[model samples]
Target chain A: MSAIKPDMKINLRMEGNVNGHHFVIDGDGTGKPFEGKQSMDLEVKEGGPLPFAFDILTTAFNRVFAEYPDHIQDYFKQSFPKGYSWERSLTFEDGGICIARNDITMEGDTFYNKVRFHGVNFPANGPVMQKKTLKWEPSTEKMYVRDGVLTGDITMALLLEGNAHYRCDSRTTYKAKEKGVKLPGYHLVDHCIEILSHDKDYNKVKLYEHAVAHSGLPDN
Target chain B: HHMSAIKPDMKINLRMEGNVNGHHFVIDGDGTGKPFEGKQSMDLEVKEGGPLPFAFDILTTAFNRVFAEYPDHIQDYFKQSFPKGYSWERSLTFEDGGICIARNDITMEGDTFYNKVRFHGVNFPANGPVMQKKTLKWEPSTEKMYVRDGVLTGDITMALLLEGNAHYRCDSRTTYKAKEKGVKLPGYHLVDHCIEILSHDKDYNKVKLYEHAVAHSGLPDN
Candidate 1:
């Protein structure tokens, strides 16, 4: 509300064996474990119907999903033909609003992994937001390229990716109590994919390097 | 990175503001009366709880370390001025909430694990009132240290002490609570880390702050 502040920059460091890392990247790709290293910058901007960082993410998600028309068609065959929604929204400042989201799906042969990717941006001098899902399916994966934009001034960019497996067997259930009401629902068993590598190559180049690197590590 | 060691004779001082806000009162014919969203502020004095007790000792050691690095300059001034017996109090306002302060004295009890807290003060900026000061002569828990208040609302052991001072300020907006109903002090906002100074107390009692020195000890964040 108060002259919307500037965006904040963020960095997440992941270290571990290569196999675990590559499996976390694009699970659909075929490659062996390779040495890994990655890093990136994100630029965030402010003032919009939504947060620019979230906008880049949700827009990329919408755009990438459009690239897979066949999968989209198959995905709707069993459910609502009106289509599905995959977006996240958040309000910023006294009157500012920012939003972000990542698209997810199962892909690849042996892995059948789910993937997510998005981008975000906010005014500089504002708080930086980091998203981490405690539970992730081995079949699931996601990556994001975001920006930090401050009051239409100063810009920083960063890229992030996550992967998980989502077989129905990976489902777990828990009970919830609300206003004297109890209900049960399915939750996916999830863990963070070991970061194989970070940096400029995160989305593409590093994905394969990590594949070969994992081959040498003893399977856990 | 401990900057200094904890001394058994270390002295601490506490002050309570009269205007501390506890909670808001709601009026409805259908619901009679009720209050929600109470806030509190209190200064505490901790000493060794029991003999060689690790739990109590750890509690006292960690608390002092956090206070040492508290972002509010008043905290440092209090630490420096209250070397022995010192008293200072100020009128409370609606701006105090985000920061919750407390202390545990584990060593005085002779058992490190049995340490306890002697005083507490709470404020509700939203309601603009002092909550309550519970002074218990004895330890709250068997080990002298009270750990779990309840799930979602309990003590969380930290590997690194978070540094920041509580900020008390004015909010022109009307509050949901009544006590301030037609009174001046209205709604209060709990501003996070608005205070300037940021530093971690490098030194803590050898027993607690550096759990990593102990084999099999869990990470503070864990």
Candidate 2:
């Protein structure tokens, strides 16, 4: 574990899975990243495997097909090259999304995939989250100290299959800076995946993802 | 210590300790979840007080004032919304953006009663913008808000629950729902200062309470 000290305090809630077990950290505790060691005593329980395929697929067909126009199938294929697994991280600071970090977990494979930010409503350079923390009173304002970390992870397998197809299997996780945690790590949020294909001028796409989520931090 | 004339009509009788400036009382939540293993510690003392503090009294006055201005239709929505769980799509968006859902149970301290109105799906501290395939989820998100005009603006703190509440923003960004096609009445505006504190988790995050104001209003018949 790299000894990079967490830049903020540990007032966070996290949800995920550890080696396929339902793992979670809620409320205040003196654990890793601070009190606990690299791998600390977080709350873990019996839960199902992360379900990332369904939502990803649902969005693929429901969103991708409708959102993207022709040759999108080609983009899907290009996005997920065969024979390698992919991992990415989207980190947030001061309430806004900063740069997203993308890389492959496997060695000897050096390349990154494409990620599109929106035309608007996304911070290309400045603060992505609202930078204010004020009290609710009229004709006046008061500020206070409150901060934490919010980052997300997505992992996927690269492989294509179909008479006319392409697909990828993936998982999504949420990472938080919790109190007492030694190392900053990810909690399994869910899984994700998408596939694309076409037949004579008509394109078909599928997607999947799940919610291993059980209320983490209250979007704070 | 000095004592003032106590009135029988006054509500509440309690003893308080802590930074008088600090939260007089916190709605504490234990940091745990559904399967359960959290507890609430209430060893603080309790006693009778003469009357509600001036600050709380004025706050209540404003609450009554602004709340009274709510149209009948809006009032109708809240009555059935919380106790039943889930709310009408239109009603949920009544303010045009935030979905205000309340808990049915009431907490009575001394004689003062506490009620709640939570602004869920806010988009401040999370990955902002619509990230869900379903646009409805982002409906309550205050991210794409046009102009958030608030009186000093709001409340979200770790009030108190055995386990902290974990509200997640959807996984990623997607195209947001388009702005409503046609114009209707303007979105709801607060006539009075509305300060809402989210029940506590572990520590408090004075997250501007990320409220919803200035909505695009009335989505196309979806």
Candidate 3:
């Protein structure tokens, strides 16, 4: 008997926030990028975060979420918090995931403090999930503050539609507590997107095609 | 990840506690039997609708007839059905505490003989001095070894040593004192980790796994 082939289709959608943005990445089946036959029919709806990593790894999502006309992403960028000086950049890493870095200046009661950080954006494996690791260097005064590391695991639904929810649960320790408010490196940014199937697919196809075309940006 | 020293000694101890006269109630898919010793224990079980395979008479027949006809073909039949590597060690939880009838001792539960059979009449399957031997399992989630920043934390496992002496196994492995916390350790978990590390920390199913002999009991003899 011949091996069953996977019918491949991909859709991409985006959502953005002050700290990060999310992309709804959909793959029709679990079949990897290239193989003669597709085995199982897979419907993966993942929230691709468009934080600094989006700028480096995948710009199609960035453009859609950051540059879309009259969109929530535009509104977010416009109404910046009090002293939000944001500069984000995305770059490819030796590993498959793209890394995003951000340099921002936030206002204190009396002065402004600059903070710089970088993180990787990647997919999850069987049981062990991996994601962007954030390393930040903060400076409030003339003092050179310590650089802390924040690692997170982002989970998604089996479908690419419904809600655009994302939570980067992280911990410096090996085992994280079951439930708590004061969790170490725990940050959850949740959003819901209810759009027509046709509209969602249309936007997704456009973004996906754009990504495939411009994937060769960081040649050097 | 088995390191065999050409002529490795071997030992087997069958602490047959379950009365083989009882019906063969399969507890889990691995084919280990949940044998009953008395009417009280039998009452505690969730009675199945099916008829008991080993009634007292049938139990006697299965125990006596099986080995009585231990023709080469019958032994081969048993070998093929239950391969060498299948094993499960469970401590007996009953009124008789440390009173484990050694493999050589054989008795009857009711009318049928309750015999603790061993692979060889000489050597016994001994747990480590600490009474916790590392074992391996099939699933990846269970496979784990102590790692500090991607480095091995302790010895992988306790390897078996064989000798040309009368006793098959001699001078078992010794290592630095390792303490298991309040919870008892499962032998399979360590084995799983060893297998995973041996296979370059990849899929364990793709590798050749050396399994310890598991168990099955019938009639009054375990």
Candidate 4:
């Protein structure tokens, strides 16, 4: 089948067997990012005991062939090196050992895949092992506080209150007077006005009185 | 004392008990979001024999004159809110046990009405009745403008323009359709394209344009 289109929906189903029980698996991934949802089901064909049933039959073909082709053989070798573990053994009714593999390829916005069974007597394990590490960092983008009236970011605005008047980045806090010098953000005019107005210092007192007098109130 | 005709300059004076004989108050509602500036004098009344003063008639003229610069869209909203007209209560008081208690009920007016009289208690020394010379009333409403993708639809763009320039600066940026998807419901094509302007500043002078591709879902279109 051709690769799945970028915007197209995908639905795939395949049949396989392990020990003596017949089973089927299917995948359904739609839209972008391709986080497909997969399902597996089993049915009795011929009742019997063919050790290592769970390890050989329970494995998914898509995961082996497409998703992790290189690690599939190692997984089987390492997990079931000396045959299947007694604790994880499966004796089913009418089952057969059948290993299937599926490979995926992409072209343009479309996606394609191929499925097949692993040849009998495959290698126990491979020499190579793939390792990957994922790192996530918080965003440090700058946002404006429009006219100093409303904070463009809701979370940042919420952090500013009575005691801790100024906030920088995500988690830093500072006092009103120490805002610009100690930290790196602007002070709210109204907040500064309140502090200055309450001060009895001669300089601030004069400034406060002047501000109140010219505050647009009609003189009586 | 004598009775006078109801006019814009009629002053309502109610005598009340207080510590000082007179106190001048320039009540300025700064930082309270109310943005009010009023002047009133509490004076002591000697003899009494006058009719109750009409505070509504005096306040109605002052309120309308101050709020004459209402936005056009807000005017339309008011028109819709009160198709005919509206009326409410008004009360002002000077002195007695507290300040004046002048109540003017159901003072019919054009489309606006005020309904409360709040007196800020003042303090001083000399004991005598406190009298108010004049009062000013104001309560600012803090309303905000919000925009969503649906609000970006064309018709609303023009309506917003008529409202005020300080709120928004938006215009159509693009319009297109789909090639793979079929015709969508509501008699439109499968896919469509659109773009609009969004202003960041309060004055709506600076703005950024954005483009969009609306997909077909067979749902009812707005």
Candidate 5:
């Protein structure tokens, strides 16, 4: 009973300032599948004009992909002509079993780019399968700075259910190579609500891609 | 390096991704130098087979890269601190501007376990001495689940940030408890940057995460 189209790509040019840094995501795929290449750039303009404003602001977005994993994964898929390859491993719990290649490239100014990203999701061992909910609330926004970069924060909540069986466990382990190296384990479960948030962006554009090219780099 | 002295934790697998090398760098207890200033990322894998001897290999590799330029005392500190491995929850930085952090939870695929690891190199001359500032990197993801036969599967209905950074202006959370006719279910909700797909498949799990709520369904309507 929802109007949301599954697998359709929704594109938008996101720009704004949290404190002073600007960011943008320019691409074309409004009604198509949510997989395609786009331009992701960030820059800074201090209110009082500082010497390292550009450097500080530019490298500030260094963790941009860390905050925008979804965006990174999407662009990664678009970077490939036939799409990068992704395979499932043995379970659907960790996004199902999967394996794929990823390429991180160095960009001018600062930071690294997740390029030619390839991933795989193998089917899990189960009798039933999972399905999409296709319904989501309008995303909200927040802002903050870390590592000298002004970033954006976005959030969304969703509802989904599938027939797949999921299980979790936790245990500690110590390697024999080195003594006193104790690693902890955890698995916590409590239900209430689920929210999705994304942070980091600058209204400024560094490398803009306005042409058609599968390379993860900007084409403008 | 003698393989006999290696007995590191093989629970999580680490793979370093970056440019300047024309490829990805594998961390297996063998340290490598950072030729120039560049960006880097980490990919983790979990295992289920026999004791993986490679875990020590990665730590050894990371130790050399991070403490190679430090004084003998500093190197010795790292040697003692990370004989088995470093804390998977915290981030570490080297004198030359290298940093690495591990994800919170361990993922499962059959008997094998997996974890996510990240690494970055710093250029002091260009970016200053690796400044310890926070970045706006956040992601929402799904959680642990259980399965049972005969439970009805419900179609997922939800909304998400298809594009752009949402900040924190959204809120849609739900929790459901079953009654009479029921469906065996796992926890489902919105998460930040925690979606991984391979064609038609999906998976989600992470640690030190920030989550929100939406709508809870399939509970007792009483």
Candidate 6:
């Protein structure tokens, strides 16, 4: 949805409500799931769609993946050829058990991501089931998710970041480092740092791919 | 040097796409330079991530090459429209389109030029166009426009607020037009070359910008 590219990669903070359940997902956070106040947290409204905010992140990130542009969604398909899913099971000392899972797949132009937060016997009160469907709005000059009617700063940043990530996927030319590339611009992952060299374009893609993978928000 | 000082806010997301001197340069902070001048038009893009500082340095060096190599007459064109002080106005259809109708009022009060741009979107905000004024400057001594080189000028953003919620906005005004690098520099051009982009919005955030060449591109939009 642009003839122009953001001068920088954009990201989101996600500080708002989805289905009347309040949440605050920090854009600048340690990439860990269920760190309480460190990264993400949810506060359930009195009879909200979910009993508790057990796996609220799944619901939140679903909007992010779903809202991606048409070309970007294709890149996602390549990475998750079999579709993608993440599940976590937690049992507390106070007679409580919880299960959280997220499933994502694509159908034609639409993206469907399902999140489930289930609980048994106690305080976490978690039972959430949600499926988000995302599509592009071609009528407008700017880019936006048809599903995102509400405004949140972090959500906006996430949208910008997704658009930015695809730029590396699309542009970025490779010269295959003169023997080995230099630092400064190349943010190296373990493999490249050890393998000695890679083109700057490849390195940029590597970095963005890592960023995309971390969108899943793994548990520590 | 130490890229550790880089943070979310300090990520420097500015792009420069315009012709400088006789050639064109399009730098997107990707640690490389793109050739836009004399090249066929292609699908332009906005990339997500890359080495910004390195790319910017590359851009600066490119400008420096022109500065050191080209004659001052050729170099003067990059600085302003009039190497000899001149003032004029023009009206044309803005090609890089948006949903706004705009105009500017240029007043000269003793050696200073006050350019106030006024505009309103087709169905924006419902409260109508904004009410205020902004102005640009000209360096009479150097006979050039007081525009910054290769940087974002104060930009203008208009929110399509309907039902008290903004539907869309025009931000990232980094421009490569006239004698300025940043977007929203009014009356910076009087004539001397082709203009790929230009905008109107002296004050009050209400904006109107065109991305394609307005004049000298076959017929005249001006």
The candidate that wins on TM-score is 1
Can you give the lDDT of residue B139 in candidate 4? Answer: 12
Candidates in order: C-alpha RMSD to true structure: 21.4, 22.7, 24.9, 30.3, 25.4, 24.3
**Candidate achieving higher lDDT, 3 or 4:** 4
DockQ of 3: 0.01
Q: Which candidate leads the pack in lDDT?
A: 5
lDDT of 5 at A203: 31
Per-residue C-alpha lDDT of model 6 across residues A151-197, encoded as one tens digit per residue: 11111100111221000000011121123221111110000001112
Model 2 spans with C-alpha error above 4 angstroms: A1-150, A153-203, A206-220, B1-76, B79-222
Poorest 10 consecutive residues of model 5 chain B by lDDT?
A: B200-209
| lDDT tens per residue, model 6, B10-32 | 11122434321122334332111
The positional error of residue B215 in candidate 5, measured at the CA in angstroms, is 12
Cα deviation of A154, candidate 2, in Å: 12
Name the candidate, 1 or 2, with the larger DockQ value. 1
Q: For residues B1-222, what per-residue lDDT tens digits would candidate 2 score against the true structure?
A: 343222122222112221111223322211111101111111111122212121121111111011112343322212122212221111111121322222122233332323332212321212222221112111111111111121111121111111112222222111111122222222222221123332322222111111112111111110
Chain A TM per prediction: 0.22, 0.20, 0.19, 0.22, 0.21, 0.26
lDDT of each: 0.19, 0.20, 0.20, 0.21, 0.24, 0.23
lDDT for each residue of candidate 1 in B56-99, tens digit (9 for 90 to 100): 12122122211222232111221232212122111211233522
Candidate 3 segments exceeding 4 Å error: A1-8, A12-23, A26-220, B1-222
Off by over 4 Å in 1: A1-98, A101-195, A198-220, B1-5, B8-13, B18-222
lDDT by residue (tens digit), candidate 4, A177-220? 11121211211110001111212211111111000000111100
C-alpha displacement of A148 in model 3, angstroms? 52
| Interface C-alpha root-mean-square deviation, candidates in order | 21.2, 18.1, 27.9, 21.4, 16.8, 22.2
Error of 3 at A100 (Å): 27
lDDT of 4 at B131: 28
Task: Please compute and give the TM-score of the first chain of candidate 5 against the native first chain.
Answer: 0.21
Per-model TM-score versus the true fold? 0.24, 0.20, 0.16, 0.16, 0.18, 0.21
